[PDB]
Structure formats: C-alpha cells, structure tokens
Paper text:
The unc-51-like kinase protein kinase complex ([name]) and the class III phosphatidylinositol (PI) 3-kinase complex I ([name]-C1) are the most upstream and central players in the initiation of macroautophagy. [name] is the central scaffolding subunit of the [name] complex ([name]), which also contains the [name] (or ULK2) kinase itself, [name], and ATG101. [name]-C1 contains one copy each of the lipid kinase VPS34, the pseudokinase VPS15, and the regulatory subunits BECN1 and ATG14. The two complexes coassemble through extensive contacts between the [name] scaffold subunit of [name] and the VPS15 pseudokinase subunit of [name]-C1.
The ordered core of [name] was purified in a form consisting of the [name] N-terminal domain (1-640) and the [name] C-terminal microtubule-interacting and transport (MIT) domain (836-1059) fused with the [name] residues (363-517) responsible for binding to [name] and [name] ([Fig fig1]). Image processing and 3D reconstruction resulted in a cryo-EM density map with a local resolution of 3.35 Å in the best regions, including the [name]:[name]:[name] interface ([Fig figs1]). The structure confirmed the previous observation of a 2:1:1 [name]:[name]:[name] complex, while defining in residue-level detail how [name]^MIT^ and [name]^MIM^ bind to [name]. The [name] core has dimensions of 180 × 130 × 90 Å, contains two molecules of [name]^NTD^ and one molecule each of [name] and [name] ([Fig fig1]). The two arms of [name] consist of 120 Å-long bundles formed by three twisted helixes (81-495). The two arms are connected by an 80 Å-long dimerization domain (496-599) bent at nearly 90° to the arms, resulting in the C-shape. [name] binds directly to [name] via two main interfaces.
Residue numbers in the entry:
A (entry chain B): 1 to 220, 303 to 597
B (entry chain C): 840 to 1044
C (entry chain D): 462 to 476, 487 to 522
D (entry chain A): 1 to 208, 304 to 600
Write the structure that this text describes.
C-alpha cells in the first residue's frame, strides 16, 4: 500500500510512500511540493470527513490517504483564476500508431499474409485496448473521489455554517439581553453622572491620613474630595472615562447600526444554506451512466480479446498448414471480424473521449461551484471576525455595567460608613465605661467572698466534721464578671464627632449623614 | 451415733460465750484495774458511757438476738433428730437439750426486755439509724475475740503469762463458732487465719 | 513465737439498722412460738435410751 | 566453679550441685536436710559480712559458695545440746603397718631381697608422708574456714546489736516525749469528757428526732465509738507508766551491756593458734621434703647395693640403711605428732566455738525477745499519740459544728444575693449585646461586605465580646439546706457554752 493525495478540481491523483507517515500536514503539502510542485499557499487539503488538515498534525492521525482514499486537495489560486482550468491531458501516443498501421494494413489486400500482419497489429492494438480503459479506471477512481471530495468540502462548509449559526444565535441572545439593558444602562449612566455631580461637595475627610494608615507619619491646602479618590483607585481609569467609554460602546452597539449588520449576517446564513449550489444536478445518475460505460469496457473486451485470441491461434495453425481451401475463406472472415473489432476499438476511443468530456464538464461546473464556495468562505471569515469583535464589545458593556453599578452608590456608602463608624466609636465609649464599672463591682464581690470563705476554711480544715457531716464547704464562687473583657473595635479609624461635623454642615450629601 | 452430741455441746459452749460478751456489752463498761489504773478513767470513760449507753444496749440486743437464733437452730436440729430416731432419745442428750432450752429461754427473755427498753430509742433515732449500716453479731463477736487476744498477748509479754491461757481458749472457742456463721470466703479465710494463729500460740504454750 | 504472734495480731483485718429493727418484732414472735414448742416437747423428754 | 557450704558447729564441708545455685535459700535448706540429714528448722545460715538468709533471695545473690567463701550453716540442734560435737579423722591402718614394717626392716639381714623390701618400704613411705601432709593441710584450711564462719556470725551479731541499741534509743526518746506529755494527755482526756457532755445536748440538724451530735459521733466507725477511744487511751497509759517501762528499759540496757561482751566476740589465743599451727604446717612440709630426699637416697643406695656384689660392702651399706631407717622413723613419728596436734587443735577449736556459740545464741535470743517487746511498746506509744490527736479533734467538734452551721447559713444568704446580682448583670448584658448585634448586622447587610469593606473604611468587622451574656456556673450545690430557721432552733436549744459561736451573723 501507499499514501495518496488526490487533486479534485483537475482530477489528478497523487501517489506517496506509506513511509511518509512520520511527517506533518505542513510536511505533506511540502511533500506535494517535493514530488509534485505547487506553492503551499495555494494548497487547501481536506479529508473524507471534512476535517481541514491542521498543519501541525501528522498523517498517522488521519485515518485515510491510502491507495483507496487519498486526501482531497485544492489549488484555490487556480479556482480564483478566471479561466476554467483545463485537462492535465496525458499523451496517449499509441493511438497514432494504431490508426496509421490500421489504415496501412487495411489498404493492402486481405491475403493470409496481410491477415497475419493484421494479426500482429491486433496483438498490439487490441492488447493496449485493455490499457485504455485501465486508464479510464484510473479516471473512475477520479470520478468517485471527486464526488467524495465534493462531499468532504461540503461537510467543511456545513461545519463553518453551524459555527456561523451558533455564533449569530449567541449574538442575538446577548443582544436580546441588551434589548432592555440599553435603556437600563441609560438609566444607570444617568445615575452615575448624578453620582459624579454628587461627589462634588462631599469631601474625602482629613481622615484620609488614617484610611491610608501606612502614610500617617509614615510618608516620612486642598479640600480633597471623593472625586480624585474614587478614580485615583483604579488609577488609569478616570470614571468619567468609564462614562465616556460606556457612551461610546453604547453608540457602536446601537440597534441603529447593529440590526442591519445582523440582517447581513442572516443573509450570509442563507447563502451558506444554499442547497442549490451545495448540490449538483444529477451527479449520481451521471456517475451511474459512467459506471455503465466502464462496464462496457469489460463487456467489449470480452468481445475483442476473445476474437483476437481465437484469430491468432487459428491463423498460426492454418498458416502452418498452408491449406489453400481454408486459408482464403478463414482469413477473409477474420478480416471482416477485424473490421468490426476496429469499429469496436474506435468505440473505445469515443467512450474514452466521452469520459474525458465528462471529467471536463464536471470540472467546469465544479470550478464555478468552488468559486461560490470560496466567496462564501471569505464572507464567513469576515462576518466571524466582525461578530467576535462586536461580542467582545457587548461583554465589555455587560461588565462595565456592573462596574458603573458598583461605583454609583459610593456616595451612599460613604455616608452610611461615616455615620456607622462614629456610632461605633461612641458605643465603644459607653461599653467601656459600663464594663469598667461592672468589673470593678464584680471583683469587689469576688475578693470579699473569697476572703471570707478562705478565712473560714482555714478554721474548719482541721475538724472531724469536714466532708463527713458537712458537705460542699470547699466550693468557690463562679468568678463571674471578675476581670475586664478583652478589646474590640480597636481597628476602627479615629474618626471624630467633629469629623461628622466637618462633613455635614458645609458638604451636602443630601441630609443622609444626619444622626 | 453420738457425734451429734458434740455439735450440740459446741453450740452450747459458743452461746455461753456470746452471752458473756453480751453481758460485758451491758451497762457495766469493762474497766481495767490494778495500781496502774488511772483513777481518772472511772470518771471520764464512765461519764461518756453514761451519756451514750443506749448504743451499747443496741449492741447487747443484737448479740442476744444472734444467740437466740443459734440456740433456736440447734434445738430445732435436736428436735428433728430426736423425732426421726436419728439421735438417742435419752442419756446425755437430756441434759444438753435441757440446758439449750434454758439458755434459749433466757436469750428470748433478754432480747424481749432490751427491745422493750429500746423501743423509744429506736423510735427517736430512726432517722439516723437508716444511714448506719446494720452492725451484725459476727462483727461484734470477731472484734471482741481480736481485742481479747491482743490484750492477752500484751499481758503475757508484760509478765502476766498465767491468766492468758484461758483467754486464748475462750477466743479460740469464739472463732471456732464464728467461722460456721460467716458465709463470705474472704471473711472465713480471715477468721481461719486468726484461729490458726491462736492454735499455734496454744500449742506453743 | 510470742513476738510474731502479737505482731500479726497488732491489727487483724476487719470483716440499714432500721430494717433489722422493723423486722425485729416478727422475729421475737417467732422466738416466743419456738420457746413454747420446745418447752412443750422437752416436757416429754422422760424416756430411757442409749447410743 | 562449684558450690560449697559449711557446718561451722562441727566443721564439715557441704558440697552441692550447681543446680542449687539457680535455686534459693529454702531449696538450700531442703537439700541440706535431704543429702546431709540436718533438719530444715535447725538451719541458721550466714555469709561473710553478717547477712542472715531470707528464704526468698536466690543463694548466689548472697555472694558465697566458693571453697574460699562458702555459706555457713549453724545448727540449732547442736546448740540445744550441751556437749560439744565429736570430730572424725582420716583413719588408716597403713601408718601403723608402716611403723611395724620399719621396725621389722631394721632387723632383716643384708641380702638383695631385703634391700628390695627396704626400697619398696621407702617408696611407699614417701607417699604416706605426702598423704599425711595433705590431710593435715586439709584440716588446717578447714580451721581457717571455721574462722571466717565465726567472723561472719560475729558480723551478724554486731549488726543486730547496733540495730537493737538504735531501737532502744528510739523508744527511750519517744517514751521521754510521752512522759513529758502525760499531764497534757490527761488534761486533753478531761477536755474530751467535757466536750462529750456538751455534744450530748447540741441537736443534730437534718444534715443526713431527739438526736444529738453525740449520737451522730457515736454511730461513726462502730463499734469503735468515743467511749471506746477514751478507754483505749487509758489502757495504753496504764500499760506505759514508768513504774514498768523504766525497769524494762533498765533490763534492756543490761541486755545491750551483755551484748557488748567483747571477751566472747573476740577469740582469745587466736593469734597464738595461727602462729603455732601455720608454723607446724611449715615444719611438716620441711619434714616431708627431707622424707622425699631420703627416700630417693634409699633408692640410690639400693642401686649401689645391687651392683656392688662385694660381700664387704653390703653389711656397711645396710648399717647406713639402718641409720637412715631410724631417721625415717623419727620423721614418721614427727609427722604423726603433727597429725595429732592438728586434729586436737581442730577439736579444740570446735569446742571453743561451741561454747562461744552457745553464749551467742543465748544473747541473740534475749536481744530478739527484747526487740519484739520494744517494737510492741513503740506501736503502743505511737498509736496512743495518734489517738490523742483524735481526742483533740473530738474536743473541738462541738465548736466546729456551730461555726459550720453559721457558715452554711451565711453561704445560703450569699448565694441568694449572688443569683440576683448575676441575674441583673446578665439581663443588662443580654439587652445591650442583642441591641448592638442587631445594629451591626443591619449595617453589615446594608454594606454587604462588598463596596468599601476594607478599601476606605477599614475593619468594620468587629463585635463586642458577649461579656455578661450567660449566667455564672453553679456553685455551693452540695451545701446542706441549713435554713435560718434551723440556726434559730440551734440558738434556742444549744447549751450556753456553744452559744457565742452561734450569736453572730
């Protein structure tokens, strides 16, 4: 067996050693350059099954390429060539000899010597008769491989089409979300702009020094506002930049521009789904007729080679006999038979020309169909690139929406946080006074009771009644509320009551920071 | 045929000793004597006993009850063996059975009297009597035998080697009957150890 | 061996009252019955025999 | 290595198989009785250094058994008998037959066969002298072993004497301490009598009905009640009075004084006996050396005689033989005198050790009985000095009863106050903590730990310690329910003597 590749558009099989299994797909195109020669850029290769051979894979992967299943190749440059590509015609020189010598032998009288010369002529011509439709069997391969490669590239195109359909479906789903999210983001962007306006006149307290703890003295006037901090965190983005980019993306994603593009995408889907070009009108019955004619090869051979062998044997015997009563009639009968077999041989020539003509017209229709296929491929590539870019933009919008939502509340959360932190700073004061008082009293109680109990036990330890008549005298108080509770809220910054004052009087957050 | 008379006679002797223990447990606390006798004892110990006598009365009652039970069982055995012809009807059996009957009558009377004169004491102290685990006649008899033997040994060591022999004999005869009363094998082994030690001493004498 | 005799007797090892006293009156009734029966019998111990 | 044992009383070597080594003292006694027919109970066994055999320790643990340091066996049988034992000898008629032949050989004329008889006689005589020397040396080394036996028993005697003297001194000191405390003990006993009179009246509360505290004290550890304790103390005081103990200790000190009789521990004439017997051993060795020399000279003279056939030489050579024979007779009688002296010395040492051992046995038995008596008296005194501690405890019982009642009622009152105090504290703490936690949880829900949780307003995730949120653990759970009513009742009924301990909050 051997590795094989087949060129479909020109209908040309390619023979390769099975040994080449050790080399990649790029190496296989370069092997087509090594034995044959066509520039790699022209080479488009697909397998029965439709997979477009990835350059890095080795042929061992793909389960085809044999004598009985080469891989399909296409010179898309030749396809893009305006011309209908011509036949890589083979030079069948033997036909010239056959015609010339056939006429030569026919001209001379059909005497037994001339009939023997015609017998030799038959030995040559009607034996190469087998070669003729052996070559036509090569073409028979060519034809059914053409159908198979046609189907393979159509599996490839259909795969591209389902990828296109899924991509557009996801696009229209995310845009169905955007259907309401566009007005929602308009509202939320009004909200963010409102928030930006709000951040003016709500100063970032001098408690910045404490919020950035490491700097307080560690870095060893301007009323810095919440602006120039919100955007300072996330330095490169101005937040105003966030609004600007949201508006820009909204404009590009507007249905005004988007819906016509999706209409073009739908038309691209329709063209990808063009069953008319995807099919060939009656190629199956065409190949069925070709099957009938290749069968006619064998049938007619069963006519000729029979007659030829019989004539050869009979002429040998009769000429060796030199019988004048048998040679004339038998030889002339064989001459008329040779005339009819010459008609049959020429019929071989017409069927050869007919099958080559079939090759040519299928190749021309296939040239047009590959032009359509390449146009669809290019349109699909463009549309896929654009769809991916716009999907990236849509997801950018659908993430910046959450970023805007987060950054919108920041004045509300600043107010809530400042009020809560002052509340805790005062509640800890109250709780500390409270715990101090309670612990003082509890320690007093505990020490007094412990002193009394020990001063008694010291007397009662040396007694006969201890633990025999009187029980439980060795117990102690539960030591409850005796020691100061551990710390809490020590990590809260030193925001003053005067800081809430610093805010509220001349920095309107709209009342909310009021306690 | 007459070996049963040995059992009855031993029962008689053992109860005649337990009755002596009971009498000693009575009002007359057994005091020491001689010039070495501290005259302060007859004051202090006598006062404390006069204060706590009713517990000694209860001990006397349990001892009398135990001797009553012993004599009842012995005389029931004698009754059965006389009725069945297994025991000789006359001769020495007469005197032993009759002496057992006399001692039994005395023991029954004594325990009845002590019960009568301790009825009020029991009715008063019942709340305390629940907590105390009952003191049994075996404990009293064993403790009395042990203390008798200790006192006799001390007296023998300190030149009083003559009056000790009867005390050892009485202690031995108390323990001989005490073993038959105990049921726990540990207690029986303890009593046997003490009895065999007394036997070793008596043989040495 | 009087020394070892005393030494082992230096301290030989040792060997709810309401329940016993509650049972007491029945015990004394039994004892009275027994003394009556024993007296009634021993009154009849006048035979002659030997073994 | 092989095991050897000794009967010092007579001085007979006892030899055993090594199988007894893995065995112990009791097995040694049984083996002694079985193989050598000495009763087990009569065996007193001692090693160098003065250790007496306990029946438990395996014999080799006691480092002895070799021929130079065996076990010493002292027989009680042989000390019960008054007379000293008899010692055997190595008996042979060969010595007397040899003497008779030497006397006869002196009167046998000068002929070759006679000289042959002479040389045979002398060759045998050398061996006889050698055997006499060996037997004598066996006896003398056996004597030198009887001496380590006596010294071992002396060592045991010294250890026993020191222990007895120490015990007597200890008892004397403890008895002096008791003697200076007799009055104090008597006063404490009178005080216990007073305290029992008091306890007879103090009611016993339902710490578990005319039950007094004295009755409760009495039902404890029966039949050993307080009256028994007092009478036991009085009995011991009666048994320990100095009119007895002082004479007894006088007799004891006399016993130690007789234990100090160095005239019996030390063998007088020992040095002379060694100085004489070892010198006699040296003399017998020299005598046997001369005997061997002259026997070989006799052989050489026989060699000369058999070859010098001249009739004038044999008579003179036989005269020389007669002079030599007289020399050999003198040497033989000297050796036999050495034998007699050695045997009589062994018998004399046996008798002397017999008398000294009779004295030692008597002294040791007297000291041992005295030791038993003193141990009993020490136990009496210590038990009494512990019973007086019990007496003092019982003396102070009535006061401690009232004080404990007061303490229990006060503790009930304090618990009543403490539960209220803790209830108020926990009420307030739970109120405040729940309010604060509700507010903080509300703020956490509003903040959603999302927006500025740590970026700007740092560390809002903190809570109060839940201090005073749960009630205190239980305590004073086992105290008897001594109501204030019970204390009032005790103040109503208790005697005046223990009222001051009740009339206080």
């Amino acid at each position: 067996m051997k590795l094989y590749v087949f060129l479909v558009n020109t209908g040309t099989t390619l023979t390769f050693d099975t040994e080449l299994t050790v080399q990649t797909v790029a190496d296989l195109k370069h092997a087509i350059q090594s034995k044959y020669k066509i520039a790699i850029q022209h080479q488009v290769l697909v397998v029965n099954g439709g997979e477009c051979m990835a350059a890095d894979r080795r042929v061992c992967t793909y389960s085809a390429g044999t004598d009985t299943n080469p891989i399909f190749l296409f010179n898309k440059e030749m396809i893009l060539c305006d011309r209908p590509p011509a036949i890589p015609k083979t030079t069948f020189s033997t036909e010239n000899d056959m015609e010339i010598k056939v006429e030569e032998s026919l001209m001379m009288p059909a005497v037994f010597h001339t009939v023997a010369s015609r017998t030799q002529l038959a030995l040559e011509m009607y034996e190469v008769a087998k070669k003729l439709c052996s070559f036509c069997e090569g073409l028979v391969h060519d034809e059914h491989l053409q159908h198979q490669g046609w189907a393979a590239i159509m599996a490839n195109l259909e795969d591209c089409s389902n990828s296109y359909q899924k991509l557009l479906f996801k696009f229209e789903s995310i845009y169905s979300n955007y259907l309401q999210s566009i007005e929602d983001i308009k509202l939320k962007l009004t909200h963010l702009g409102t928030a930006v306006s709000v951040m003016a006149k709500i100063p970032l307290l001098e408690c910045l020094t404490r919020h950035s703890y490491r700097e307080c003295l560690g870095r060893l006037f301007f009323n810095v506002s919440l602006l120039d901090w919100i955007n300072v965190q996330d330095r490169p983005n101005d937040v105003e930049s966030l609004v600007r980019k949201c508006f820009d993306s909204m404009s590009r994603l507007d249905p005004r521009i988007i819906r016509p593009f999706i209409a073009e995408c739908r038309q691209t889907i329709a063209k990808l789904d063009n069953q008319n070009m995807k099919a060939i009108k009656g190629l199956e019955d065409r190949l069925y007729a070709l099957d009938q004619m290749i069968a006619s090869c064998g049938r007619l051979v069963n006519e000729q080679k029979e007659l030829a062998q019989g004539f050869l044997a009979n002429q040998k015997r009769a000429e060796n006999l030199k019988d004048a009563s048998v040679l004339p009639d038998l030889c002339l009968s064989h001459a008329n038979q040779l005339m009819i077999m010459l008609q049959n041989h020429r019929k071989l020539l017409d069927i050869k020309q007919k099958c080559t003509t079939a090759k040519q017209e299928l190749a021309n229709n296939l040239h047009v169909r590959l032009k359509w296929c390449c146009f669809v491929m290019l349109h699909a590539d463009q549309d896929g690139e654009k769809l991916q870019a716009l999907l990236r933009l849509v997801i950018e919008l659908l993430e910046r929406v959450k970023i805007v939502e987060a950054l919108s509340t920041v004045p509300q959360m600043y107010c809530l946080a400042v009020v809560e932190v002052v509340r805790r700073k005062m509640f800890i004061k109250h709780y500390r006074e409270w715990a101090g008082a309670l612990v003082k009293d509890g320690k007093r109680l505990y020490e007094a009771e412990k002193s009394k109990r020990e001063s008694f036990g010291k007397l009662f330890r040396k007694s006969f009644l201890r633990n025999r008549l009187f029980r439980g005298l060795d117990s102690w108080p539960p030591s409850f509320c005796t020691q100061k509770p551990r710390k809490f809220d020590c990590e809260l910054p030193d925001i003053s009551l005067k800081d809430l004052q610093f805010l509220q009087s001349f920095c309107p957050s709209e009342v909310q920071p009021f306690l | 045929h007459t070996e049963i008379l040995r059992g009855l006679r031993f029962t008689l002797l053992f109860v005649q000793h337990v009755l002596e223990i009971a009498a000693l447990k009575g009002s007359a606390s057994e005091a020491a004597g001689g010039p070495e006798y501290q005259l302060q004892e007859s004051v202090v110990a006598d006062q404390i006993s006069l204060l706590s006598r009713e517990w000694g009365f209860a001990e006397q009652l349990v001892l009398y009850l135990k001797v009553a039970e012993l004599l009842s069982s012995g005389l029931q055995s004698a009754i059965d063996q006389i009725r069945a012809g297994k025991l000789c009807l006359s001769s020495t059996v007469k005197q032993v059975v009759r002496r057992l009957n006399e001692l039994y009558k005395a023991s029954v009377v004594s325990c009845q009297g002590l019960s009568l004169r301790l009825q009020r004491f029991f009715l008063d102290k019942q709340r305390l009597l629940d907590r105390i685990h009952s003191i049994t006649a075996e404990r009293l008899i064993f403790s009395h035998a042990v203390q008798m033997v200790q006192s006799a040994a001390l007296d023998e060591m300190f030149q009083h080697r003559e009056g000790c022999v009867p005390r050892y004999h009485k202690a031995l005869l108390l323990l001989e009957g005490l073993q038959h009363m105990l049921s726990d094998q540990a207690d029986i082994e303890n009593v046997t150890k003490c009895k065999l030690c007394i036997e070793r001493r008596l043989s040495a004498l | 061996d009087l020394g070892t005799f005393y030494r082992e007797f230096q301290n030989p090892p040792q060997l709810s009252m309401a329940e016993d006293l509650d049972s007491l009156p029945e015990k004394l009734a039994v004892h009275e019955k027994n003394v009556r029966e024993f007296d009634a019998f021993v009154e009849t111990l006048q035979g002659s025999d030997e073994a």
